[PDB]
Each structure stands twice: as C-alpha cells, then as structure tokens.
Design a protein around this ligand. Structure first.
Ligand code: CA
Ligand code: CA
Length: 258
C-alpha cells in the first residue's frame, strides 16, 4: 500500500518522454524575493486532483546560471514533483554553500503561498550539476531526512560520505575532464556506506557539460530514482535493477547499484 504513487504504471517509453502526464505551472522568484539563494523558478503540477507531491531542488554548477539546469524543472515536474530550479548567491559558490542553498530553495517552496499546499514537506530531494551535484551530498549530510540525492557529473573535494542516509545516485560522464568520475563520482558512490540505496551510472562518451542540454538518459534515471525514493514507488524499481545495459550502442558505459 502506497499513498504516494502518482501517474500511470511506467514503461521505458513513458519515462523517456519529454513530458509526463501532468500539465505544469510555473512561478518565478526574483533574486531579491529569494531567501537564502539567488532567485529561481518553481515548476509544479497544475492539478490538485491527485494529492500533494514531493519537493525537489535543482542546483547549477560552478560558474553557471539556472539556465544550464532549467530543462529539468518542467520535465521532472510533469511527472509529479514540485521542482525548484535556481541561481546561486554567487556563480562561484562552492559545494557547501550550494548544499545550504538547495535546502533554502526547498524551504522557500514549502512555505510559498502558491505551491506550499501542493507539497508534502516530509518528502524532499536534491539534484545538481557539478559543484551543485557535490552540493546534493552536502545537503543530504546536513538534512539527513532528505529522501533522495542525484548528482550530475558531481564535483566535491570531500570524497567520503558516510553521513548520507538518503538514496543517492551519481551520474558520471565517461570523458569528463572537469570532475572526472574516477576522482569524484565513483569515490562518492563507494563511500556512501549508510545510504538507503546507492548507484553509479556513467554516460558513454560524454563530457562534463552533458547535463546542460536535454538528455534522455539523465532524465529517465533521475526520474526513476526520484519516483523510487521520494514517492517510495516500487513500480520504478524495474528500471534500477538490473539497470541499463552497457553493451553495443548503449548510452551507458558503467552501471552499479547497491
Ligand atoms: Ca567527508
Ligand atoms: Ca523515501
């Protein structure tokens, strides 16, 4: 029995679609209207007919504006999430600061006059690119009750993450020269000893900037992870285990889950 399931039973096709079954509404937050972060956009299912949803914040990476990760906002929201994409206080904020701002973005959405009543505040998640992906681990360390964390080509100087209890997925890029997975994503995966679930998924042939353009592999597995752990939706376990193929023509070069 699960109170939190939303949407029809999934298929490979459904989770790859550019939009899920929900129409999406949006609310802008200016830099000066934002408490603890640099402004952003809340993307939310228009309908209230199906109940409340979990809340997901999405951080950009080092040097970068919200525009580099904004595509995740409407896409994820359209599958049944309230999603806040945002700018940081400084484009050069480090992972610790990005973690704090992920939590600030969640908290502003939770209290918002438009979307607060659409969120289940007990069910929170964090997603981020680059140092924002490092920030997901920072946020899940600070706020252990986070349900799920997804790092996209994550960067963090701290390689050890025994504090994280959330379900944590790292998506690496095989040819990343900025945050190479051998020294960032893969160490994080290995050290996530206390995580509810941990996974590593590597994009074949990809560069560090793969998460900044719509990418079906990133979207489908981010979605499946968030459904599995923000909504406890066991219908999405089928995509995670045994997980994507790594054979001829696959977009995935490595996949691990524990
Ligand atoms: Ca550490
Ligand atoms: Ca959960």
């Amino acid at each position: 029995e699960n109170d939190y399931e939303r949407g029809p039973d999934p298929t490979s096709s459904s989770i790859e679609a550019s939009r899920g079954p929900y129409a999406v509404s949006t609310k802008s937050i200016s830099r000066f209207a934002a408490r603890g972060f640099g402004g952003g956009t809340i993307h939310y299912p228009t309908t209230t007919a199906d109940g409340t949803f979990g809340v997901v914040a999405v951080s950009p990476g080092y040097t970068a504006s919200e525009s580099t990760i904004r595509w995740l906002g409407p896409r994820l929201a359209s599958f049944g999430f309230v999603v806040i994409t945002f700018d940081t206080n400084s484009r050069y904020d480090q992972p610790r600061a990005r973690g704090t701002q992920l939590l600030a973005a969640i908290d502003q959405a939770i209290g918002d006059s438009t979307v607060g009543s659409r969120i289940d505040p007990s069910r929170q998640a964090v997603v981020g690119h680059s140092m924002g992906g490092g920030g997901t681990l920072e946020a899940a360390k600070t706020r252990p009750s986070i349900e799920a964390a997804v790092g996209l080509t994550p960067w963090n100087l701290d390689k050890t993450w025994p504090e994280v209890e959330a379900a944590a997925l790292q998506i690496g890029a095989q040819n990343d020269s900025v945050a190479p997975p051998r020294s960032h994503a893969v160490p994080f995966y290995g050290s996530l000893t206390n995580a509810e679930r941990r996974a590593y998924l590597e994009l074949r042939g990809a560069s560090h900037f793969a998460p900044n353009t719509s990418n079906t592999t990133i979207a489908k597995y981010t979605l499946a992870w968030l459904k599995r752990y923000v909504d406890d939706d066991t219908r999405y376990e089928q995509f995670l285990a045994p997980g994507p193929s790594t054979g001829f023509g696959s977009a995935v070069s490595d996949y691990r889950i524990q």
